[PDB]
Amino acid sequence: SSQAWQPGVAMPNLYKMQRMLLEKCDLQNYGDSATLPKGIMMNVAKYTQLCQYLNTLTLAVPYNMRVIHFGAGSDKGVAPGTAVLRQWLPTGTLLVDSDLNDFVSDADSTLIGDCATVHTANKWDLIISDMYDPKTKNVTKENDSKEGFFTYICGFIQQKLALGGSVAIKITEHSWNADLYKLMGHFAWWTAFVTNVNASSSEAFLIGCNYLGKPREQIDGYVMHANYIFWRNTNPIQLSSYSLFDMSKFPLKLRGTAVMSLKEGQINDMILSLLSKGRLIIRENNRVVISSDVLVNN
Amino acid sequence: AFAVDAAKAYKDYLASGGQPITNCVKMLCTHTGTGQAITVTPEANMDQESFGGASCCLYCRCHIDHPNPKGFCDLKGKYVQIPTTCANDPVGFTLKNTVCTVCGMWKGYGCSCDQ
Ligand SMILES: Nc1ncnc2c1ncn2[C@@H]1O[C@H](CSCc2cc(/C=C/CO)cc(C(=O)O)c2)[C@@H](O)[C@H]1O
Ligand SMILES: [Zn+2]
Ligand SMILES: [Zn+2]
């Protein structure tokens, strides 16, 4: 494991091509723990490693980039992941976050409520989600595709992700959704990324890199989640904090990626290829407006 | 005329021997930065830690109004550099200290202007 100096490990392509049956996740290093730098929270370390890995992909990075972060609160009422995202993203990037429970944040705007209440007028260049419901960790019931916030996330990607944009959505052994895996085939590239600091967990970030707005490949999400678990079950990942100690190249590169408005009819193969290379964002460039629906009763 | 004075209350709570506010969000960084007090990205030097600003603001953390007419917060959305010797209580530090309006450093913890 020269993997130990990486920020984490991405699911190798050959595992994506299998047709495994779903098994229980049994991680060799379950209950091992990385030694974090003095005073650093797991959530800061985890998001730092996610961003270090995203630095290796062909992300579109326009001027006035727009990023939205779901599940950004903590039981301590602060937003460590948002703080890392704001560190990583170019100065001036508009960052919105949200959580079911109240918290204070460094984001430009924060919405409190169930994610299903969140609406935005504009499209986004990057969607991050850490949402997770610990009730799903029921080892005594069958492990089926979950709905809940995953239904919202799938619709939100299809309706409010700019072509060319990317996503990183947290999943676990039991917190997953088949349509979300299916949606990964609507990106130019996808993976399941495991942070080295949290490699003792079945957590991963499902990353869709450069959205194309149509199926590039047909993915059966029940099969692919089984493939993911098979990978994790047969490839122990050594816990590691090494990458946290070198932050000299951390900030996301300002690429000034072009932003254009185009109607579905003008998305030709040449456009699709620019999207695939991280060289184009398709959306409007109007004001960013958001809201949370409030249910009124007695 | 009545106003809650949270700054005073926290100072008094600390002198009473109270445990400082915890869970301020400490960032990973190079620790080769400018050392200025409040910055758009982490700027800790070798003698400092950098923290997410909102998490180090007494008013943000206590869910109370900020003490100025339009309720603006100087820390939220920024990073605050705290001397490592004081990083056990970032909120107390930011409350009790002042930023030199010329050099951007903390008075008494980096400001050279009065030499
Ligand atoms: N539909 C929805 N809309 C909007 N935000 C939603 C949401 N669903 C969940 N979130 C939020 O996701 C964030 C990260 S989940 C962090 C977490 C919490 C617990 C709590 C245990 C209760 O004792 C356990 C673990 C663990 O790792 O075991 C992790 C939480 O801040 C949730 O509020
Ligand atoms: Zn504040
Ligand atoms: Zn000065």
d(CA B53, CA B91): 10
Burial of B64 (0-12, 13-18, 19+ CB in 10 A): exposed
CB contact under 8 A, A248 and B30: yes
Structural domain contains residue B67 = yes
Radius of gyration of chain A (CA): 18
Q: Which residues of A144-157 are buried (b: 16+ CB within 10 A; e: fewer)?
A: eebebbbebbbebb
- Could you say which of A37, A104, A247 has the minimum Cβ distance to residue B61? A104
- Cα A45 to Cα A8, A76, A233, B27, B61: the distances in Å are 11, 17, 24, 9, 22
Contact B27, B52 (CB under 8 A): yes
Question: Å from B93 to nearest chain A CA?
Answer: 17
Q: How far is the CA of A78 from the centre of ligand 1 (A)?
A: 13
End-to-end alpha carbon distance in chain A: 59
Lookup result for tokens 């085939």: A185
Q: Whose CA is nearest to atom 21 of ligand 1?
A: A134
Specify the number of domains making up chain B: 1
Q: Strand pairing of A161-171 and A124-129?
A: parallel
Tell me if A167 sits within 8 A of A128, measured CB to CB. Answer: yes
Using DSSP, how many helices (H) and how many strands (E) does chain A show? 7, 12
How many residues in total does chain B contain? 115
One-letter identity of residue A121: A
Ligand 1 center from residue A142 Cα (angstroms): 21
Burial of A132 by CB count in 10 Å (0-12 exposed, 13-18 middle, 19+ buried)? middle
Query: Does ligand 1 have an atom closer than 6 angstroms to the CB of A81?
Result: no
Q: Where are the domains of chain A?
A: 2-292
Q: What is the rounded distance in angstroms from the CA atom of residue B101 to the CA atom of residue A260?
A: 42
Cα distance between residue A82 and residue A47, in whole Å: 9
Q: What is the resolution of this structure in A?
A: 1.9
Q: Hey, which residues does B49 pair with through a beta bridge?
A: B82
Per DSSP, helices labelled H in chain A are: 13-16, 42-54, 80-88, 149-160, 178-184, 221-234, 269-276
Question: Distance (Å) from the C-alpha of residue A202 to the closest C-alpha of chain B?
Answer: 24
Give catalytic residues of A, as residue numbers: 46, 130, 170, 203
Rounded to the nearest angstrom, the minimum Cα separation between B115 and chain A is 33
Find out whether A93 and A257 touch, Cβ atoms under 8 Å.
Answer: no
Q: Is the CB of A73 under 6 A from ligand 1?
A: yes
Which secondary-structure segment (H or E) carries A112? Answer: strand A109-112
Q: Report chain B's C-alpha Rg in angstroms.
A: 14
From the number of C-beta atoms within 10 Å of its C-beta (0-12, 13-18, 19+), residue A117 rates as middle
Longest dimension (CA), chain A: 59
Under a CB-based contact definition with an 8 Å cutoff, are residues A80 and B27 in contact?
A: no
How many Å apart are CA B106 and CA B92, to the nearest integer?
14
Which residue owns the Cα nearest ligand 1 atom 15?
A132
Residues A106, B60: C-beta atoms closer than 8 Å: no
Tell whether domain A2-292 is in CATH 3.40.50.150.
Answer: yes
State the burial class of residue A14 (Cβ atoms within 10 Å of its Cβ: 0-12, 13-18, 19+): exposed
Q: In this structure, is residue B107 part of a structural domain? A: no
Tell me which residue of A78, A108, A77 sits closest to A91, measured CA to CA. Answer: A108
Q: Is residue B6 part of a domain?
A: no
Contact A186, A208 (CB under 8 A): yes
Residue A74's alpha-carbon distances to A45, A56, A66, B24, B48, in angstroms, are: 15, 28, 23, 12, 25
Residue type, B44: A
| Residue ranges making up the domain that contains B58 | 20-96
Instruction: Tell me how far apart the alpha carbons of residues B104 and A74 are, in angstroms, rounded to a whole number.
Output: 31
Distance from Cα B21 to the centre of ligand 2, integer Å: 14
**CA triple A132-A250-A173, angle to 5 deg:** 25
Which chain B residues are closer than 8 Å to A74 by Cβ?
23
Comparing C-alpha atoms, which of A73, A190, A75 is closest to residue A131?
A: A73
Q: Domain for residue B42, yes or no?
A: yes
Distance of CA A66 to the CA centre of its chain: 15
Q: Which of A60, A85, A94 is nearest to A253 (CA)?
A: A60
State the DSSP code for A223: H
Residue with tokens 């609507």: A186
B47 belongs to a structural domain: yes
Contact of A49 with A196, CB cutoff 8 Å: yes
Side chain identity, residue B3: A
Q: Is B62 part of any known ligand binding site?
A: no
Distance of CA B99 to the CA centre of its chain: 10
Distances A213 to A159, A160, A219 between C-alpha atoms, Å: 9, 11, 15
The verdict on a CB contact (< 8 Å) between B28 and A44 is: yes
Q: Is B108 on the interface with A (CB under 8 A)?
A: no
* Total count of residues recorded for chain A: 298
d(CA B71, CA B10): 19
The string of DSSP codes covering A155-216 is HHHHHHEEEEEEEEEEE-SSS--HHHHHHHTTEEEEEEEEESTTTTSS-EEEEEEEE-SS-S
What is the CB neighbour count within 10 angstroms for residue B77?
Answer: 18
DSSP of chain B, one letter per residue? -----HHHHHHHHHHTTPPPP----BPP--S-S---SEESS----TTEEEEESGGG-HHHHHT---SSTT---SSTTSEEEEEGGGTT-HHHHHHH--B-TTT-SBTTTT--TT-
Residues with Cβ within 8 Å of B62's Cβ and at least 6 positions away in sequence, in order, are: B6
Residue A42 is given by DSSP the state H
B24 touches B56 (CB < 8 A): yes
Long-range contacts of A285-290 (CB under 8 A, 24+ apart): A285/A64, A285/A259, A285/A261, A286/A121, A286/A122, A287/A121, A287/A122, A288/A66, A288/A94, A288/A96, A288/A120, A288/A121, A288/A122, A289/A120, A289/A121, A289/A122, A290/A96, A290/A109, A290/A111, A290/A118, A290/A119, A290/A120, A290/A121
Rounded Cα–Cα distance for residues B29 and B87 (Å): 15
Q: Which residue of B has its CA nearest to A251?
A: B41
